């Protein structure tokens, strides 16, 4: 006769399954076996297991031994799981169906399998010239959906930086390394920064940080041909082109305008002459340079002409006026 049922060892058996674990992978059981005892002799005594639940089908269970596997044709991903907790009701059978039951709860254990990415991949940042140490630039952050360290994130930047910005390792704060930023030196920069997470087997993302550098109207004009000495003749007469005066500024947007700035004229025996302020002129905005005033050597031998160059749109007064100015010696020849 069938005088009892089955029971089972323990009444919730706790188990762990690895995600992406191949189809007959065994759950790890971690309190014993699955094992149900019928205390009846002989045919009354033989259990057939099975196993019942919202998610049963991604397992197997050997309906003689109990054992509990991944079934073939699913996948087992802890990302479409939370909490990554399985319930399951365990029920064993006897030949007259009488039964007992055990809970089955398994954790899905955390397998590296997604990679720090970038929303968006790519990120574009102006940033104003002359910017202290330490300054923020901006703010990346990449996503990982992994957990633990698998999911936790170092940030780093594998090129471009050129000692120039500094990365925070954990909030992906970039900032101005201990450096000058100077938009003269160089316009803009491409940083690659990484996201690397923790697991086992790490993986990384990366992204790229265009950092455009903005413009202060910073750098004083330049000067290209600082001295120049020319021989002029004394029937030379007004209005006369004799010489050319020509500066750079690489900010920006630069209105250079050109000034005479001191005419120191000399006789024959190199006794000044005074009042020769008016003898050339300089076009303001070309730096051509004029016989303005009717010549002669043996008034004047030789004109000591400084020149300089404004930047009307500077933003520094500072660096808005020419260092060193523009030489011109004007030695006047005889006819
Ligand atoms: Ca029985
Ligand atoms: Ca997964
Ligand atoms: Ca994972
Ligand atoms: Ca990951
Ligand atoms: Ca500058
Ligand atoms: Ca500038
Ligand atoms: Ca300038």
Redesign the pocket.
Same mark, same amino acid.
């Given at each position: 006769e069938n005088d009892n049922h089955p029971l089972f060892t323990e009444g919730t058996y706790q188990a762990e399954v690895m995600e992406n674990s191949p189809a007959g992978t065994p759950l790890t059981v971690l309190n014993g076996p699955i094992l149900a005892l019928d205390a009846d002799e002989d045919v009354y005594a033989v259990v057939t297991y099975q196993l019942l639940g919202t998610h049963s089908d991604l397992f197997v269970i050997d309906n003689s031994t109990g054992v509990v596997t991944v079934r073939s044709g699913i996948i087992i991903d802890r990302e479409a799981f939370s909490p990554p907790f399985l319930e399951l009701l365990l029920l064993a059978e006897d030949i007259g169906q009488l039964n007992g039951t055990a809970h089955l709860f398994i954790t899905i254990l955390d397998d590296?399998?997604?990679?720090?990415t970038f929303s968006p991949p790519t990120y574009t940042v102006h940033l104003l010239e002359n910017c202290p140490p330490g300054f923020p630039v901006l703010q990346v952050t990449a996503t *990982?959906? *992994?957990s633990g360290l698998?999911?936790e994130l170092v940030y780093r930047i594998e090129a471009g930086a050129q000692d120039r910005f500094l990365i925070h390792p954990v909030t992906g704060v970039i900032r101005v390394g201990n450096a000058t930023i100077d938009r003269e030196e160089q316009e803009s920069y491409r940083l690659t920064v990484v996201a690397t *997470?923790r697991?086992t087997v790490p993986?990384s993302g990366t992204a790229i940080v265009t950092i455009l550098i903005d413009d202060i109207n910073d750098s004083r004009p330049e000067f290209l041909n600082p001295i120049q000495t020319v021989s002029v003749l004394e029937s030379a007469e007004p209005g006369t082109i004799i010489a050319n005066v020509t500066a750079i500024d690489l900010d920006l947007n630069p209105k250079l305008e050109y000034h005479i700035i001191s005419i120191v004229a000399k006789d024959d025996t190199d006794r000044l002459v005074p009042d020769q302020e008016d003898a050339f002129a300089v076009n303001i905005n070309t730096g051509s340079v004029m016989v303005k005033s009717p010549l002669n050597r043996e008034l004047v031998a030789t004109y000591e002409v400084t020149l300089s160059v404004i930047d009307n749109a500077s933003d520094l007064p500072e660096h808005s006026v020419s260092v060193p100015n523009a030489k011109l010696t004007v030695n006047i020849l005889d006819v």
């Open positions: 590296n399998d997604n990679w720090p *990982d959906e *992994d698998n999911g *997470d697991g993986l």
